[PDB]
Amino acid sequence: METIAKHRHARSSAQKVRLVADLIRGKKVSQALDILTYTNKKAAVLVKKVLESAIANAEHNDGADIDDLKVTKIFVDEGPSMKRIMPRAKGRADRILKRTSHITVVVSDR
Amino acid sequence: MYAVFQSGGKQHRVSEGQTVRLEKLDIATGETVEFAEVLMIANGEEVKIGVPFVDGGVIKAEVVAHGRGEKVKIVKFRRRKHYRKQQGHRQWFTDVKITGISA
Amino acid sequence: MKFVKIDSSSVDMKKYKLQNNVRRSIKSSSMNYANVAIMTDADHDG
Amino acid sequence: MKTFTAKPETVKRDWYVVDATGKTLGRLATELARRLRGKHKAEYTPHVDTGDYIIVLNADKVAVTGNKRTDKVYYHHTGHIGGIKQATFEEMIARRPERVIEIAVKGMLPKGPLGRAMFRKLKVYAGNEHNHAAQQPQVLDI
Amino acid sequence: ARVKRGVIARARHKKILKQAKGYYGARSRVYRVAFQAVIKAGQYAYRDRRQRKRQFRQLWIARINAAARQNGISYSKFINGLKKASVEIDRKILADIAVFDKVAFTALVEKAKAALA
Amino acid sequence: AVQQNKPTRSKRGMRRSHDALTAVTSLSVDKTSGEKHLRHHITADGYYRGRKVIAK
RNA sequence: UGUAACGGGGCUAAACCAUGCACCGAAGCUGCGGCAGCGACGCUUAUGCGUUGUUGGGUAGGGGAGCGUUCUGUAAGCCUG
RNA sequence: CCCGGCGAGGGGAGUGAAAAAGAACCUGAAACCGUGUACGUACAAGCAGUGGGAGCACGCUUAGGCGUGUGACUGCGUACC
């Protein structure tokens, strides 16, 4: 069943985040949380908080049924890139990009 | 039963009751045709020539459609010489069906 | 009335264009002036 | 119409054998390549391999015309320093005779996957015996 | 009066790219590239439509020359016997016979030798 | 340096093959509490092999 | 730098000389079909044609015929929730 | 109301013709980035295509084919100004 969830305007690079996603696809719910918890990245905490919400976003808003549940569609799509300067030698500046990644999670029994 | 003949100056092999797409002609849509140009005939036994046609060699078909062929894109390009060109084409064809065969 | 913060990225932008054109333009032959020593050897006037 | 073209599934291949004793090298291999390429059949498709399995035997007995036995040379390079190695026809027979027929055919065949394919068809032996009987060698000579 | 071109440029580009559908990488996406890829593709066509008639007519011969030898004669002499026997059959239909019907082709070869004798 | 021309997206896609993460794919269950924890590492509550230590 | 001064295999003819008959092979010629330009023809008679032949690679360049965007009048009309 | 740090962001409910009108808020193209599915790809050398050309998977249909996607193998071929 549906009840997706998403996080937007995060501060992180979709590339980085995109590593965690591969570790969970088609997988049972509970395993992920166990996988993410003992995984070490700045993103695991981030993405996990979302996934935690999708479930809670279900039972209140729909038929619940956690013990039989799955992660079907997860993906990442980059968001805005903020523009900043880090100066350099000789007087030249450089445009640096703080990159942001939208997130989407689809959790279903099937 | 398969035989052979000329139509547009290029030969075709054929059997009874099957369609063929060949060069444009001037005819009625559904009327009929013949051919005295048969080069060879075949069957469980063989009949062929030492001279064109055969003897009484004959074929009969029934015209169907005059429709136009599928488009082509034609180009002339020359690198660095400031010359390029574009041309299209569609080739006429006639579709027929074989009525029967005879010696 | 319900506006999103203020995005000053355009500030660092205008500073980048301004900073980049300033040096890149008036810095002149400093890369080359320094290269000038190199310029006096790498040349081979023959 | 659309002229006929062979299909791998519909292919029918076959086995053949040759005794190279007394044969002339070059004039032998050309026929061996004709077979493997399929130009001897009616259905030949250039992008398909219609060739028939061949088994040479008693290659060491092969002969050549003139002084090429002590003259004709083989060359191969190791990809090192520029170092090169050469071996005479005489030598190669006393050591790796199977290479000879296994080489000359290659130069007479196309480069690319296909030429490597039909080359897999061929089997050579310096002796008069082969263990491939089960597939049967309906005999051939030339 | 003033003119704005934002639109009929899309037309051109979109058209081209459609013809560039399937090509690899930047050649199927950017216009500044595909434009020279298609214009080059065409002049292979204009070049190919010429030579395919060479490809088949060097194939059809190869088909034949085998079967001839399979009947114990060589391509060249086989033809000449027909031209002496007054047979106009094209090489296209002929080769097609050797694949399907062996009889006629076989039964035919004796013709040449007969007249060519 | 000076890349003479730019690589593809497919290329770098291959460069990043081995860069992929490897999952732990193993956990434990406490000899008493039944909690989930790594091998050789303590539980959040501090239980290690059924023994209580930290009590914090 | 590595066979290396036959393209390579390989060739005592699959080399050279002489003689001869076939065959292959170009977008060349011919065959079928189509488009356009030019000229005479007699009708036609800014036109059907009948044809009859012939032409039609092309840069700098010259001439001719054209596609399509905006705006204006035709339009207080036409299409359109 | 729920998740969430008595955040951000989000999902429900609800308004509203329309949240494919939610503040960054009419339309929302391309480069660029990703998920998903069919096909192909780990003995295969080079403007990356074209011509041919299996096999595979689909949608049609008719009942025998027609189409779309891919594209194994092969001839040729060294971009633009």
Q: Domain span at residue E75?
A: 1-117
E46/B85 Cα distance (integer angstroms): 12
Task: Determine contact: E26 vs chain D, CB below 8 A.
Answer: no
| Helix, coil or strand: residue D61 | helix
- Reference E67, options E40, E38, E99; nearest CA is E99
Number of domains in chain E: 1
Q: How many CA atoms lie within 13 A of D91 on its CB side?
A: 9
Q: Distance from residue E41 (CA) to nucleotide H59 (C1'), in Å?
A: 30
In chain C, which residues have their Cβ closer than 8 Å to the Cβ of A86? Answer: none
- The answer to whether the annotation marks A27 as part of a ligand binding site is no
Q: What angle do CA B28, B34, B39 make, to 5 degrees?
A: 140
Structure tokens at A80: 């805005």
Chain D contacts to E (CB-CB under 8 A): 1, 3-4, 39-44, 46
Distance from CA of F51 to the nearest CA of A (A): 21
**In B15-92, at which residue ranges do the beta strands (DSSP E only) sit?**
19-23, 40-41, 58-65, 72-78, 83-89
| Helix, coil or strand: residue B9 | coil
Domains of chain A: 1-110 (3.90.470.10)
B55 near B103, Cβ under 8 Å? yes
- Give the nucleotide at minimum CA-to-C1' distance from C3: H23
| Helix, coil or strand: residue D40 | coil
Surface of A (17-56) touching F: CB under 8 A: 19-20, 22-23, 34-35, 38-39
Residues in CB range of E35: below 8 A, 6 or more apart? E16
Mutate to test the interface with C, among A8, A82, A83, A96 (most CBs of C within 10 A): A83
**Axis-axis angle for helices A42-59, A29-38 (nearest 10):** 150
Q: Which amino acid is at E51?
A: Q
DSSP D91-116: HHHHH-HHHHHHHHHHHTS-SSHHHH
The CA radius of gyration of chain E, in Å to the nearest whole number, is 26
Report the run of H or E that residue C4 belongs to, with start and end.
Answer: none
A99/A89 Cα distance (integer angstroms): 24
DSSP chain E: -----SSHHHHHHHHHHHHTTT--GGGGT-HHHHHHHHHHHHHHHHHHHHHHHHHHHHHHHHHHHHHHHHTT--HHHHHHHHHHH-----HHHHHHHHHH-HHHHHHHHHHHHHHH-
Torsion of CA B3, B7, B8, B9, to 10 degrees: 60
E104 near E63, Cβ under 8 Å? no
User: Under an 8 A CB cutoff, do D40 and E67 touch?
Assistant: no
Q: Which amino acid is at A11?
A: R
H helices of C1-46, where? 9-26, 30-42
The data reach a resolution, in angstroms, of: 3.6
Helix and strand element counts for chain F (H, E): 1, 2
User: Under an 8 A CB cutoff, do F24 and A35 touch?
Assistant: yes
DSSP 8-state code for residue A99 = E
D119/E47 Cα distance (integer angstroms): 33
Technique of determination = cryo-EM
A2 near A106, Cβ under 8 Å? yes
E65/E74 Cα distance (integer angstroms): 6
**Axis-axis angle for helices D97-107, D113-121 (nearest 10):** 140
Any atom of strand H under 7 A from CB of D11?
Answer: no
User: Under an 8 A CB cutoff, do D42 and E99 touch?
Assistant: yes
Chain E residues 6-45, Cβ below 7 A from strand G: 8
Question: For residues D115-138, b (16+ Cβ closer than 10 Å) or e, as one string?
Answer: beebbebbbbbbeeeeeeeeeebe
Question: How many pairs of residues across D and E have Cβ atoms under 8 Å apart?
Answer: 31
Place of tokens 């897999």: D120
Count of residues in chain F:
56
